Amino acid sequence: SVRLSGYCGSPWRVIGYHVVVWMMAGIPLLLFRWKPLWGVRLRLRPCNLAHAETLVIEIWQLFTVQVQTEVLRYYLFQGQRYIWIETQQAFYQVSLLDHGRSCDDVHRSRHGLSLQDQMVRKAIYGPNVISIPVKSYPQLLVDEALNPYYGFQAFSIALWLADHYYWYALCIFLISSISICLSLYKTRKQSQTLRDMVKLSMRVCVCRPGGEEEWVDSSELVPGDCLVLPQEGGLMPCDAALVAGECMVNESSLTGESIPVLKTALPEGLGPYCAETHRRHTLFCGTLILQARAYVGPHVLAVVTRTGFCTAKGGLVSSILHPRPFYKHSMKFVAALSVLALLGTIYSIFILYRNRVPLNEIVIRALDLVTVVVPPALPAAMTVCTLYAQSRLRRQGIFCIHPLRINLGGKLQLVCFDKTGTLTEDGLDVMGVVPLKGQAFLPLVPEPRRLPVGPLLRALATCHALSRLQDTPVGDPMDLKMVESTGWVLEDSAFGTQVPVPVSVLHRFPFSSALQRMSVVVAWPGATQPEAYVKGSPELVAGLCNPETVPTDFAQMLQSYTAAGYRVVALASKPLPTVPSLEAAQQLTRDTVEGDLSLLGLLVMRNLLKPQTTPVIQALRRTRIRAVMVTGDNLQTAVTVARGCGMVAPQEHLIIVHATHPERGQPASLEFLPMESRSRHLALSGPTFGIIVKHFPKLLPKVLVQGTVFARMAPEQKTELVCELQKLQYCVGMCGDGANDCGALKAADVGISLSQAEASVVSPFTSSMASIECVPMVIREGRCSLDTSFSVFKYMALYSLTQFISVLILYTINTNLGDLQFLAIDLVITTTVAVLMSRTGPALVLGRVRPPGALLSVPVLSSLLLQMVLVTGVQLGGYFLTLAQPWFVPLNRTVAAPDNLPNYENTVVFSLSSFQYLILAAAVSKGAPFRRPLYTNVPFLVALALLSSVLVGLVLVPGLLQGPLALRNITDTGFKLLLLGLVTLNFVGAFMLESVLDQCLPACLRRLRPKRASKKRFKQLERELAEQPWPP
């Protein structure tokens, strides 16, 4: 149930709300976004539903919808339109206005719709368009750009402004704002580009009363219009009901079925028309018409029934506009960092109190804990990392309007694949022709054009009812595919060879839905007599041939072909004793030519795998990523595609699970059907999955773990399957191209859309090519992005702790680092490094091992502690080595910083730490397995080299920036070379530590604490099934 609350508005109250939400703070905007009821109570006063300009909809979950007007008030909730009915005082959806009208009403609507009625119904129903509104820059900002670390950055900016660091807070604010605005611009431009490649309209012909017609746009279509369908077919603009002629539709975009569907004219009657009862007669929006043929009249008419979001495709894409729910692994890491930073802050407060500095300085340093935990350039570094990942994906043709979900691509353990249009082509392609030699079959010939010039070749070429329209063959889709395969050229009719004799059709018997076959009579120069061909259903066509021409294994071979989802159509022929002339061959009755045939062969049609599918599936199976086929097609085609695709290896068992509906007196039962030709896969249909979910809730986890083929699977069942897999703690990806996959793509963690319609403009990922090559690309980019994010976080931690240790060592001496030294270290070094280190691309190939999913790892913490030990050792060694020199004179301990600068202690500590900030940057930037080698990042190499050169110039060149940076000029060149030597030892030690840890720590962890269990539910289920398989 839902409740609609009305809220009118007043100008003074609106301006008051605006000023109190803008001039006061930005916090009220986010608070109102968290709870819209407070915002609507503050801005809008309660009113009556008949006078409301606003509705609050809870279904509780609260949505605020404005009440638009066209004296026709309405509102749009998740796409659906709810007009305000003025006689019953409610907002009734427009979907309910055509309810109850019968088939006679639909047939009376075949004379078009008058213009005045057209405008009335366009006001009522709106445009015939599935339009998803663009997210504005504020909403895009909140959902994408902001991070919880920007709150820390805002607090630190407030702290800086409190302690009067204007040229530092301003620079940090500029960097963060530029990163945020550039990311918003990139995401907005990608969304606009996605929505510019979707064609929301066509030029459709509509009947108009009075015998006239008019070519209107596809958006002017309203329920009641009578479309005139073109004979060449094309995409369907809306949901209609055939009232004249019949169509041949390819509904693979809505249902996933690859076999073309024959839609027939709606039958006249008093019963109410229903899109489910009369689905055999309805044309659905988004489906492709392959052939529109009319018996009576010169046009194929289809009365429009639903337009816009009330269509089937509109209903499918409307269910994903419902809002439903990345940093939790990093907040634990920053809390672990905060423990160390708090210990250091306690030490700093104690050692500053011993120095008797003002208490305000002490409390400012205490509050500096937040800046220590979250560095100033951490949010900017993360935003730039996501920007680099998004740009790298876009340069490959993949649109990512949710850059925060790129890291989820590196966590994927399972990928669900649609079959029709994603793994295979949309329709049926010619598998081959099976000739006959003597009395028995011959091996299948994949290319019928390679056949000799015999009866079978001419039967494949000429036995059809094709026509020429705009220099292209127009007719039955299977006939089109057969003639394309045979290579012959269409020009009663004449056919020229692909490069023999051009045979000419002398007569043609039309294809009938009762006889399930068609016949032609052809002749060619140099022949003794005409030759009549027959093409149709193999079972009944073979019933016309001679018993000595049909092989004894005909039924077995037909069963073998039709058990794999193939569309077999038989061909037959017979020499005709008729004279080769049109005076007699045009008067031949069908019954004489249909009898005493000779089976020439079979023509196998199959749903063809795309060439880019098998390598990708084998690649995913090599890296131990589960491949699951989630299709709306039948079980035989799905199983055949899985077996020939790589999801099921030829040596791996496949089990069909068949759930029986519980009838009266019996309960639901599961029976498993093992077939011939993870080593144990499960195949099951949609109804079987639905019965297993509700009647066998304990066996559902085992089905989900072992199942690999899910056929006849409804869109709601697809998204339910994705959700159930995610309940097993899977990270489920999904690749789809149809409207049936929208719910699965939205519910999945990484949903890549191959669609060219409005389903793509709201998907996280959208590939520009119609293959699944994007899936390995997305996974590689996700692994690279996860590795880069972990490297950035580790570098920020190492930086913060290095600077904190340096500052503590200086505080113990009653010294500080220095304002301009702080500015150099942060802005010039760490901001540059964090920006340019996120630029390294993904590795060329996928790997078996995934990147770690948590920042609190024994490897990560151990590496951080060892690098900190090395850094602290180097800095303290430099300090205690400066303290043992003849030229060294101690600082003036009486005065405090920054007045005791320049001195030797600060100079040495800054000299060592500045090199450490680059060493710890080159160290955490790891390449393989998940990233390219470091040296491929030319900007980052150049930045590191230039900064190292600058720091070596500071160390060695006498008088270079020793004044600005408040450094002290050292005259002992031996000490300068010894400091450089300490820097080199730190460099080699950091790299050796990283290599030794990365190569020997997992082995040490395995040997010390043997992890004999896992917490992921699917892994425990896999262990349990390995110990005891569920189907014995």
Ligand SMILES: CC(C)CCC[C@@H](C)[C@H]1CC[C@H]2[C@@H]3CC=C4C[C@@H](OC(=O)CCC(=O)O)CC[C@]4(C)[C@H]3CC[C@]12C
């Ligand atoms: C207050 C005064 C006296 C101090 C001046 C300090 C500047 C030298 C700092 C401030 C911000 C720093 C910048 C911070 C960010 C970057 C990003 C980086 O450029 C890119 O990000 C391009 C990325 C690509 O190659 O695609 C180059 C270094 C740079 C400009 C830094 C160069 C040094 C800058 C200009």
Ligand code: BEF
């Ligand atoms: F397009 Be899929 F087979 F649902």
Ligand SMILES: [Mg+2]
């Ligand atoms: Mg599809």
